[PDB]
Design brief:
about 15% helix; two-stranded antiparallel ribbon; RNA-binding; 1 helix; alpha+beta; rna binding protein; about 80 residues; CRISPR-associated RAMP family protein; crRNA; part of a larger assembly; Csx29; 1 chains
RNA sequence: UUGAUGUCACGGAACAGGAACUUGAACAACAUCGUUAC
């Protein structure tokens, strides 16, 4: 979640709705589209959270977890 | 404000069509202003 847990006045205050196309190839105009919300990254660049690990899990599963956390490229 | 044994959404170009156009000799002669007198 956001760091200080603030409050906004709706999704229009932090982002904007955008239409995404799906064009054809031969008669290259377009067809069915869809919509999403875009949020800029110069205003909300951080997200904090926790991971709770058992005590007697292992001593090498933590290594796999850390390497996978560093290797994860994209999200959202 | 999620629930866990299973998320290709970096799986998808806001794309495709519409002439700021049409009409116009930089040219020229008759007055203006109201009252006076019996």
């Amino acid at each position: 979640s956001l760091p200080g847990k603030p409050d906004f006045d709706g999704p229009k205050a932090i982002g904007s709705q955008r239409v995404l196309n799906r064009v054809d190839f031969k008669s290259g105009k377009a067809h069915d589209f869809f919509k999403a919300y875009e949020v800029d990254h110069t205003r909300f660049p951080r997200f904090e959270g926790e991971i709770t690990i058992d005590n007697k899990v292992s001593a090498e599963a933590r290594k796999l977890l850390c390497d996978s956390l560093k290797f994860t490229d994209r999200l959202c």
